[PDB]
Amino acid sequence: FVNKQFNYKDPVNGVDIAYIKIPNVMQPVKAFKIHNKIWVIPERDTFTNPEEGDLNPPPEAKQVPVSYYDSTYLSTDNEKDNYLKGVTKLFERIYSTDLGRMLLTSIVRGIPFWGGSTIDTELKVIDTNCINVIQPDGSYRSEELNLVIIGPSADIIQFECKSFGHEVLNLTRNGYGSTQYIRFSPDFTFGFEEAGKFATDPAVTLAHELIHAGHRLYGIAINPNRVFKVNTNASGLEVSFEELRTFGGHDAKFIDSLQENEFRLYYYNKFKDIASTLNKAKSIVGTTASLQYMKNVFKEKYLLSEDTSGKFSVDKLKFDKLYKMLTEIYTEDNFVKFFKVLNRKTYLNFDKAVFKINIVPKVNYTIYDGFNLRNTNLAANFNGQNTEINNMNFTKLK
Numbered sequence: 001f002v003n004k005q006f007n008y009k010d011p012v013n014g015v016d017i018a019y020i021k022i023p024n025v026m027q028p029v030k031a032f033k034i035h036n037k038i039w040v041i042p043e044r045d046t047f048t049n050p051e052e053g054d055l056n057p058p059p060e061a062k063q064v065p066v067s068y069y070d071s072t073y074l075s076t077d078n079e080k081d082n083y084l085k086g087v088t089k090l091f092e093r094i095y096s097t098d099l100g101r102m103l104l105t106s107i108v109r110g111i112p113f114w115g116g117s118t119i120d121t122e123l124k125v126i127d128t129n130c131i132n133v134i135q136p137d138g139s140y141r142s143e144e145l146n147l148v149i150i151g152p153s154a155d156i157i158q159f160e161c162k163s164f165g166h167e168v169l170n171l172t173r174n175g176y177g178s179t180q181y182i183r184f185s186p187d188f189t190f191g192f193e194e195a196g197k198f199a200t201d202p203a204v205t206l207a208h209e210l211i212h213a214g215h216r217l218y219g220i221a222i223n224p225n226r227v228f229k230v231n232t233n234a235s236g237l238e239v240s241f242e243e244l245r246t247f248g249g250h251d252a253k254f255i256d257s258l259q260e261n262e263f264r265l266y267y268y269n270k271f272k273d274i275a276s277t278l279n280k281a282k283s284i285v286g287t288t289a290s291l292q293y294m295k296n297v298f299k300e301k302y303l304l305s306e307d308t309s310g311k312f313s314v315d316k317l318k319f320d321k322l323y324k325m326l327t328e329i330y331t332e333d334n335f336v337k338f339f340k341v342l343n344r345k346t347y348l349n350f351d352k353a354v355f356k357i358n359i360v361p362k363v364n365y366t367i368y369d370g371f372n373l374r375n376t377n378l379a380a381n382f383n384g385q386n387t388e389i390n391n392m393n394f395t396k397l398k
């Protein structure tokens with residue numbers, strides 16, 4: 001992924017090290033472009049939501065291990081540079097896998113759809129899928145992006161994948177897609193069990209959120225109000241459809257196949273409606289690109305087919321393979337296979353601890369092995385992820 005190594009200090013160039021302004025809906029922040037369509041903001045997320053940046057906790061917090069609230073985290077350049085280094089390692093670690101390489105490839109190629117004009121012959125960018133990059137003269141220049149890795153808000157361990165919405169349009173649920181703003185930190189991780197056994201490889205945590213940027217970027221995300229089945233332990237919580245697709249594994253069986261049938265067709269007709277909009281396109285808004293460059297971008301995104309007229313169609317086959325890839329190949333469970341790590345086997349493993357970590361030094365954690373370093377004691381029984389055995393790399397907190 002990252003071609004050049006970046007330092008937070010590194011001078012702004014208005015190209016890949018810039019001060020930037022998020023769709024609001026305010027002050028500029030230093031952000032790094034670590035790859036086409038992917039920016040990292042080494043700041044706490046006090047921007048995406050309305051004044052949801054006070055860092056200070058509210059009334060009664062869920063406390064460790066369900067919440068953490070240090071107001072001071074990601075305040076210092078030294079932390080910010082470590083943060084960037086931290087996300088610049090997990091990406092690569094992710095890229096090193098044939099699956100992560102494909103996923104990231106999916107994310108990069110998944111340009112949000114230029115669905116912003118009221119007139120149905122017109123291709124126009126949705127400004128919410130842009131950032132403003134500050135130029136030498138203090139002027140801003142609309143830029144198109146796919147995914148932003150930003151710092152956590154107040155609750156530091158509240159990692160999520162979110163997106164700006166539309167007055168009418170459900171951009172994550174209509175095949176259009178939307179710029180993603182994942183709120184994440186590689187400076188902490190969750191402990192699970194099966195005495196405090198082990199710890200999550202943050203690579204997996206980040207892989208989870210990217211499986212989200214995936215579905216939301218391709219506009220195939222299940223509505224958050226679709227929860228599921230009651231196969232209770234021998235009085236219990238329920239899990240989101242979306243979250244069950246994404247973790248994968250055994251639990252990705254609890255899902256009514258004829259609700260998956262019923263979606264796999266919903267996002268086919270959505271894709272088809274995209275193919276129509278493009279065919280019916282006579283104008284494009286902007287200086288940037290032609291109606292033909294942008295029609296090929298999206299031909300490329302939605303794996304559309306181009307006849308001799310140059311009319312686009314959705315191949316039911318290419319679609320099924322893409323849908324299978326994003327929805328059921330790209331899963332936390334299948335990542336843990338590739339990473340050769342230990343992870344919660346389900347979503348009902350109440351992480352009983354948040355640990356302080358530093359994945360930056362190649363003595364602590366590396367791209368190839370994570371914590372479980374080869375030619376060390378750690379490379380067996382995931383003794384690298386053991387909170388006990390490897391107490392230096394895992395310091396439980398409050």
Ligand SMILES: CCC[C@H](NC(=O)[C@@H](NS(=O)(=O)c1cc(Cl)cc(Cl)c1)[C@@H](C)CC)C(=O)NO
Pocket residue numbers: 065066157158159160161205206208209212243347348349350351
């Ligand atoms: C970022 C990677 C995963 C991610 N997990 C979560 O946010 C939760 N993690 S969890 O659901 O796995 C969870 C499970 C249990 Cl039993 C207990 C807790 Cl604290 C967290 C909590 C942080 C919620 C606030 C996710 O799916 N976001 O869409």
Ligand SMILES: [Zn+2]
Pocket residue numbers: 208212243246
């Ligand atoms: Zn999730």
